[PDB]
Structures are given as structure tokens and as C-alpha cells.
């Protein structure tokens, strides 16, 4: 079905609308560039059900799959993320491989290909080691439907879909060589003939598995079904550079038609990190539409296919045989953009491609030869490029490039999900609402911690505090008591009830009225005075217990305390006889140090608050701290200032840890985070408030400082959560 | 020892602190005044487990038990509420009985306890003393001293060594003294001045101050006696009699009783937890059979027994009771024989209050009491005799008074008075919990958090319908409104969709998307509806479409086009897997049927009890203001003007309860299909309770997917039950019961 009244009805935005799927095969490899020759990583979710990351043929060869997305931009986001999860999950020794043509190729015995023999037998194990990028595009149904009405001619919707897809495929084949001229990365291979110096593309080139001499028919869905089905007298064997992947069986196409098209034409791009460029994917999209668009038989296709294989073989450097056909295609394509009012970016892209016809070196094929030549070996550049990419990605290990904005608790959850093979949808990028489904089972999480497993009332309880206080004391736990007096005369009377307390005004400024009795309510007269000063400042004054001790935070999931975090005020240790400034800068060199929100840790600054306190320590920016002399630069633990979080899970006594599990269970929360004040972590727990006191309960606990502590073992909470949700895994 | 001298550590504030309980016994009775002579109401929870409402002995005799509270102030709200729940629960035919004295006694009734032992116990008891004396009912006053004040008392007292012995000795001292002076309490508060029960006493209107504390009032025997002198002795006394012969220790009858008692002896390790005082007769003049002032009076008095240094000797205690009996038998109008003792006794009380820095109010109370010694006319007993003569009989007043109170309970049927301030939804749940008997406690009156505990099962509910079964993700899903939309489009429910355009050019370009779709085009943020274009039929032209988008952009930076919906909006209340109710709300109105003017018409409609503040009551009274008066002009009517003949006059354009619109139950009237959708939407949300708002062109026609057929307005995670419980014109659907059951299905 080829016609474009679309322009007559101005449906420009719709032709662009669509969906984009994407698979990339890369070979797991050593630093040398050799094939990994080892098993698929255990961390990765089951090869059977893991949607994003799987293994195609060789256990060593790996395939990354991006979910389908309405915007080409979101595909890359995913690809980027999947690649980073993989790089970071991959063993330190093993690495990913940039190019399609394997650089170091093993004997047949070597490749286990752990989970095809007949298929393997007919062409052999080695050809299968070739790796590529499959690009799948499907037209927006709305777009098509609008189009179907306009066509008086077609009585069946499926025929029109079928016909439209067929048109696109047939046409894409006809001009598919230009794509191959622009982006071919298969010039060389390690092993019969050294070949006719270089070639544009070996795969498309005859001596590739991809290159069949059986005539199928893309003219009619029915025809193709019969040509295909009769050739049996299955689905896997046919090589179509564009593939009809719409349905499980060809017959079903008569019943249901073709739902989308998968293009197998492409080679990995060594220059781009994930093997594709957003621009190239966009280019392809526009190109597919041009296929459909052009008003435009088997032989023309067959001719096209022939032009495809010759262009492959040609040395990339030398000028293409049919730049002329190519220039004409790109020019009409420019025209196509005019009428659809395509965004400017596209214009820039087709323009650059036009430049490429003229300058062969600007071509992806051509650029690679100089560089590969410069590396001196197919293996040398590939291997060189494996380290750059793994290495480039390990820069911000805590955060996923794809979703830098999402909270770190949430970014990490993502990682876990993608690595474990659970299928996830970002319902709100901005609100950190994730939807996770594995199998029929579906579970929604928000901000990582919030799960189905938490009743609403738990959080409801913790927010209130009066309730928590009243509910916790009944639990029998030690809860610090607050006493509030409307009237001062009553307060003097109430002196019997208080111990170490602080008397403050509900609302005061400049700390007025605050009186602190630490180990101190010894005389009634001083107590009375404290109330008076307090009472001038506000209509209501409060009396609260004052407990001194370090403060800890226990992350509790389920029945056990998962982790414990201590926070300490900005400081540098004096070990180095280095300028504290010199010493400070040294502490900020770690990637985990950035502003507080974007990175797990904040960056200490030697400002006047910090400078002032140092002076209390006797120091100056310039002083060199004696070995093992810790200087604190703040009296405030919040890491906002630059405090260090240190894991205390092992160091903390288990008495409290059970107390923390005891407290959160009383609240009814499966994932609550408890803040406690404990004078002696080391000494065993007691009923007396002298040992400890419960200071707070959090409905949505942090995760991230736990996962990425400045010092101390990293306890990963997101997996505990992930397992908790879908325990079946 | 004497706590009195240890006011040196300024324990006056500690002294006032305590735990307070209360048990009041009354007999459900007919307006006639005759006993009910029928079964315990169905509505109340099971008698075996019910903590708030029960029957002491006679099925006809019911007793209200208030949960202990830190303040005597609160027990009364509990009491007020419990008695209101009881008043509302009885068949209209049945009323409550105010006086202690049985009105018309049959010769009758049975315990009706599920356990065998109780029936045997009551049977043995009815046989021991007959059943008439049992018939009489009265308040019990339970008071427990704060444990912290006791510890402080104890720390100073070197004499005891053991904490419990101190606790036993204190309570004992308090009991003894109470017995000697208890007569003072009865005189003030005698309420039993007045045939079948005890006509042997000569009566010609010749009333005694209190019939109960007299010999004819049931004391099982002269021979039974136990010493309060020592806990160890008391126990020996109770033991010996049980051994051989009260049936048990509970059968021991006395005006003050030790408690927390599994058995007396366990006190020797456990200590005495608290005391129960039974001297009191229901008083006819206070709505709930006792007053706060009087409740308080006893507390201070109880303290005084502690405060005085002296403890009464066995002789003293015995003398006390004889005195109390004589005083109780005296004629109400005459002055007490030992009135000076009373003046002296109340005199110390004052010194004590002054010393402890007690509240200003208390001084007021005791004084009133002194005034009462000068002239007995003021005493409840003296007052009662006056009142009894008014309708000529003991019984007549009791029926007039019961009537007076059941009426009070029924004004504001919709709200529980103890906690008027709480949301209606919550007062309503409270009611239901109390009627059902789930032990309930309020953690924050203001935040609305409640704690319901039955057996070893407890559930925490905030705002009436927020419970354990509801999970946390659902609310978050519903908060978003955007996320709400995504979860919902997946299930396939019809949800209107909004598309936002930053670029006008793209908007015009993207025009095809909505053509024969009825869209409302509006700027993100606009004033006076500026730039808002509505398209009821659909976007017919490119040109009309461009103008609409063009104009909005003039108005705002970010412009949203949203799907237009039309129909009557409906509120389904979904709980669990079933939709429990559907409610619709109409614009304030009246009907001209009456031929009254709109002014008269409206006045009649507000007369309804439910109407009041929209906030403090289910429905808000229509007001005939100018905004209301304009609507009239359109109808061709005026305030004076008379609506004619069953004509609907509309006085608002917005169907808002806030402006006096009515609420109508359409549970049954609505189509089944939509109802499943509310259950369907709730499922996608994964919410146990959800209130789902749909826009529906026709109740009656079956639902179709398409928006023209069908639509969803919004998803609410805290549904407004009271509207549901009370429609202006609907059939009441109570959802608080549905909620409770789902909470405690085991019930």
C-alpha cells in the first residue's frame, strides 16, 4: 500500500510517531581482546526470563535488549543503562567487545555455547561468533488507522498493514546498500582468505553467514507464507536483512497481519559506546519512512540485494559504485522532511550523510580503517576500546548514566532490577514511581522503600509521633518523654515529675529560654528559674528528657536489622603531615564526593565555620596535623555539611539491633528505618534509658548512604527489598 | 504511716493523679416506668466479651462500664457516650431508668450468661437473697493511686522496707477511714428514699435518707466479718469464710472493696491494685446518674482518708457503719445527727486542698457541700423527696426523667456528644465500636487515630476508613492523579486523557490526534477562564482548533488539551471486592409543592435536625442570599414569589453540600455495570477501601468502554462515609459497620 495523501491531510507528526525495539550482540572478552571463554555471570537474572540481558549462541556472546519505547530517546536511555549494569556486573578480568568481527577466535572445542547442532553443523560454530545490532521499528497504529480510512482501495485493515509493511521492507532491501555504505564496521576478521587490504563490510559480504539463493516473496503476505512454508517442504533459516517478526508463525499473518519489522542489517559501531548513535537510529527511522514514502518488483529487490553484496566487498576508502542513486535517495529524503515539518536535527543529520557520499572518510566504514590501521590490528583497537568503555563507565559507579536525576536510592534499585532481570516501567521519572513485573506477578515501589508490604497505617503511625510515642511505650520500649505546660504555676508544681531535662519555649528565637540540665535537676530553685526565662518567650513551654550518647540509625527490613549507619561531622585525619587544605582536597578527590544530593557524599569546605572550629583545635588551613590527629571541621553530623557516614552493622551490639527490629514490628512496617541514641554501642542493652532511647522512626528510609558509605562495608539494601517483593526469584 | 507529713517533697500534684473507673447499673424500662421484662437488645456486642455494655444480673438490669481513664474528666465523656449509645440502641419502646429504686417490680428475669458457672452462681445467689434486693441498681466508683506517686511515697517511708506492704497498708488505711466517714458521703448523695421490695418499713411518704444502706437493703448476713486491719488478716478472714460460708470472695458484700484480686492472697505478693466504692445510689437529676463535681468530690475525699494521720480501729470502723446506717435512715429534710463530724471532716479537706495547691474548682465544690449541711433541702436526698411529691410517686418521676434523657440522646442522633469535635465519620465509627464492644482507645482525638483491640487482635484506624488492609502504595498511587491515570489506562478503564503542548506549532501540527474527539482546550494557568475554549461536539475545524490553541498560548506558557466529559457525576464507595454504596449530590433546592414561598419553603427544609454547619454536620442549611436570589430570578421566581406545584427551584449551579445541596443514595438505582467498575478501579489501585468518582451520562443504560458512554472523574483514598451514612433523601447506608466487620471478621 503505497500512497501519501498523508501530506494532503498534514499527518506529519504521526508518521514520526512509532515504537522502537533494539537488540545488541557484543562478545564478552578479556583485556587482550580475546574471547572470554567463560560462563555467563551468576548475578545476571536467569537467562530464561531476563528480558534485558541474555545470551544468543556462545555463552560468551551476549545480547542486550531494550524495551520498546514511543521515543527513540528512551531506547538509548535504556541501552545506556543496560550497558552500564553489564559493565559493572562483569568480572574485573572480563570486558565487552566494540566491533562485530571477533578479534581473537578460539577453536571449535573451546566454545561451550552453554544453554542448534544442525544449524551449527551446516555453517559451523565460528560464523555464529559474529555480533550485530538489530533495530526494530513499528508504525504507530493511530497513524496507520487514520491512513486506512483515506485509502478507498483496501477493504481489509490487515491487508493495508501487511501491504504497508511489505512495501517498507521490499523498498528497504532495494536501497539497503546505502545504509550499509554509511555505517559498516565489518572490514576484517582474524582467520580462510586474507580476502581480496580492507572491505566495507564482511558480513553483508558474501563470506558471511548473513549473505540464500532461494526466492521468497515479499510481494504478498499470502505469497510469502507459501514460499516460506513450501521451502520447509523453518522460520529461523531465512535471511532477510529486514525481517518480518510480527507473528509467531507465517500462517498467523493471514489471520492477524504483520505487527512490526526487525532490521538485522547493522554492524556494531566501535566509535559509539553502546554500538549505535542516536543520530544513526534517527537516520534509519527517517530512511524507513522514505522506503514507505517513495511511490516506487522482486527483481529490483534482487538487484538491490546484489548491489548490497558488492558494496560490502569494496574497500571502504574507495568511492562507492552508486553514490548517484545514494545522493538521489538522500535528496528526496530531505524533501520528505520538508513536507512533514521534521525537526531541525534531522536536517542536520541527512545533511552530514550527504557530506559523507562526497567524502568517503566521513563514512563510518572509512573512519574506522584509518583508526584500525593506526591501532595496527583489528584486535588492538577493539581491545583498546573495551577498556575505554568499561573504564569510562566506572567513573560514577553509584549512579546510572541513564537516570542521573532519579534519587540515588532509586537509581540503584533500577540497577538491581535490570541486573536481576525483573521487568520495570518508569511510571514517573520525576516522582520515582517504578512498576515491576516478573511473570504474572506485579509490584509497585515508590522511592525504593515504599512497597505493597507496608500497610498505610504504619507510616501513618510514625508521622504522628504522639501515636508512635504512645504506641511504642506500650510496646514497653524506652521512649524519651516530653511534657508540655500551658501554665507556669502548674509547672512549678510539677517539679516532682522530673533526671536530665531541657526546658524550651514552643516558639523562641536566638535560643531564648532553653535551659539544659544534663545530669542536673538537683535544685528546685534553679528549675523554677528555668521555667520563668522560658515562659517569657512563648505561651507554652516544654520539658523534654536530655539524653547524651552517639546516635545511630538501623535499617530494618522484615524481621532483622539489615544495616546500621553512624554519621560523623566533617573532618580530616592528621595522618598525613599535609596542609589541612592540602589534606582536605585529598578527601574530596573521591567520586562519591559531590554536592550532597547528586552524590552520596558532600564536599568539605574550609570556610569560616570550618576555619573557626579548626582554630579551636589550634589549627589553621596551613597547619600540618600531627599523625593520627583527627581534626573535626564541623560540630554538625549532617553530611550536607560534609560529614562521613560509616557502617556500624558488625560493630553495633545485637541487643539494640533486635530492639530496632522489635520497634519497627510494633509499628507494623516491613521496611522502617529507626534512629536511636546509644551511649555505648559495645555494651549490652538494658531496660534503663541510660543505655539507649528511641529517637525517631522513618516511614521511608534512605538506603543510599547505607549502600554507599564513606567508610565501612557497603550493605546493599535494594536487593533485600527486591528479593522481598518477588521472593520467588 | 502518714503521707500527710511528706507534703515536704511537694507531692500535692502527684496526689491528685490517679486512674478512674466507674460502673453504673440501671434497668431498661418502659415509658410507663415498668421494668422492660424483655431480652437484652440485639444491637449490642456479645455480653460475654462486651467491655462497655453489659447486664449485671437481671436481663432487665444493664450496667455501663467505663474504661479507666487518667482523668475523672474523661470517664464522663465515655459515660456520656456509652449511655447515649445505649439510649439509641434500645427499642424506642424501651427507655432507661434513672433512680436506683425499682419502679414496677415483677415476681421475672434471668442472667442469660453463656458460661454455666455464672448461671449457677446467679441461681445460688438468687436463692441466697431472693431477687428483689438484687433488682436495685447503683454506681460503682473505682479509684487507683498513681504508681509513681506511691513509689515516691514509699522511698521516704523507712518503716516498711517492702513496696507492696506499703501499698497494702495505704489502701487499707484509706478503706478503713472511708468506712468511718462514708456516712458523710451517703448523706450528701442519698438517692434511695423510697412497696413489694420492702414495705415492712412504715411508709406514708415517710422516706428515709437511703433505703439501701439500711438493714432491709441487702447485706447477706450479720455473722460475716473480715478485718481490714492487716492484709494478711483480711485474707485470713476471707479465706476462713470461703473455706466454711460465702460461695466465693466476689460474693463478699461491702461498701468498699479491694481489687485486682484474682484471689485475696495473691495480694501478698501482688499488692492491692485499687479500690472499688459502692456506697453510691444513682442520682435522678444528673443525666448519666452521677456528676463530675460529685465524681471529683469523692476523689478528693478519698485522698483525705489518705491525708489524715489517724487510721480507724476495728471499733472505730464498726462505729462508723452504725453511724452511717442511722444517718441513712434519717428523714431527708432533717439535719444529720453527726453533722459536726461532717463539718469537721470537710474542714480538714480544705486545709488539704490549700496545702496541695489544688485547683480553684475543687474549693468551690466542697464549700457547696458545707452549705448543704446548713440546710438539707439542698441535699440530693432532700431534693429527691421534693421531686417525688411532684408527680405524686417515686415511679412517676423516674419515667418523666428517662423520657427527658432518651430525648436528649436522640437530638443530634448523628453525632456522639462526648467527642462532638471529631469528624462525624469517626464519631460514627466510635459509636459502632462501642455498640459492638471492640475495646477502643483514642490515641489522638485531633489527628483522628484510633486503636481497636479485641481479644489478642488489634487494628489501628485513622480517619475512620484507613486500616491495616489498605496498603501504602495505593494511596501513593492515588495521590499522583497522574499515576492514577497510568495504572488505570492499563486495566482498560475509560480515563479522560490530557495532552500538554509547549510548542503551539506542534500543537496545530498535532491536530489530527483529536478531531472528532470532544476536548476542552485550556492554558495551564489562567485567570477568569481567559483562553479556555470548550468543545462539546468535538474539534470540527483546523481553523477553529488553531484559534483555540492560539488564544490559550497568549494566556499561558504551557498549554494542556484535555478530554471533555459530560454526564451526572457519581460517587461509588467501594470496600473490598464489593461496592457498598453510590451517592449523588444535587444543587441546593426546594420544591414548590407546598405552595409556601421560597422563603417559607427553605425554612421548612432547614428545620431538619441533620441540617447545620456543613463541617460540623452532614448537611448545610440552604441560605437565600443574593447569589441564591439571582438563581431565583432566572426561574422567574423571587424569595416572596411562590414556587408552584411540585416545581423544582434550583438555588445553586454546583451541587455542593458546602452550599446546601442535598445528598441522595443511588446504590440500588444505579446500574450494576458501573458498580463493578468501581470495584475494578479499586482493584487496579490495589486498595481495600476506595471511594471512586465516576461521570455517567445515564444510570440506567448498560456501560460501554467509550468515553461518551462512560468515564472516570477521580480516585479517592479517604472516602467520606457520613455523607453515605446520612443522605438527605437517600436510604442510609452505614459503612462503618462494613469497615469494622472487615477489620474483625472473627467477631
Curated annotation (Swiss-Prot), chain B:
| Boundaries of every ATP-grasp domain copy | 485-744
E.C. number, please?
6.3.2.2, 6.3.2.3
Q: Which UniProt keywords apply?
A: ATP-binding, Glutathione biosynthesis, Ligase, Magnesium, Manganese, Metal-binding, Multifunctional enzyme, Nucleotide-binding
Q: Which residues bind Mg(2+) 1?
A: 693, 714
* Recorded superkingdom: Bacteria
Which residues does Mn(2+) 1 bind? 693, 714
**Which family does the record claim for this protein?**
In the N-terminal section; belongs to the glutamate--cysteine ligase type 1 family. Type 2 subfamily.
Cellular component terms (Gene Ontology): cytosol
Which PROSITE patterns does the annotation name? ATP_GRASP
Q: What does the subunit comment say?
A: Monomer.
Cofactor(s) this protein cannot do without? Mg(2+); Mn(2+)
Q: Which is a Pfam family this sequence falls into? A: Dala_Dala_lig_C
Binding annotation for Mg(2+) 2: 714, 716
Q: Which reaction does it catalyse?
A: L-cysteine + L-glutamate + ATP = gamma-L-glutamyl-L-cysteine + ADP + phosphate + H(+); gamma-L-glutamyl-L-cysteine + glycine + ATP = glutathione + ADP + phosphate + H(+)
Instruction: Quote the protein name from its UniProt record.
Output: Glutathione biosynthesis bifunctional protein GshAB
Q: Where is this region: Glutamate--cysteine ligase?
A: 1-328
Cite the InterPro entries for this sequence: ATP-grasp, Dala_Dala_lig_C, Gln_synth/guanido_kin_cat_dom, Glu_cys_ligase, Glut_biosynth, Glut_cys_ligase, GshAB_ATP-grasp
- Free-text function comment from the UniProt entry: Synthesizes glutathione from L-glutamate and L-cysteine via gamma-L-glutamyl-L-cysteine.
* Residues given in the record as ATP binding sites: 512-571
| Lineage, uppermost ranks | Bacteria, Pseudomonadati, Pseudomonadota, Gammaproteobacteria, Pasteurellales
| Positions contributing to Mn(2+) 2 binding | 714, 716
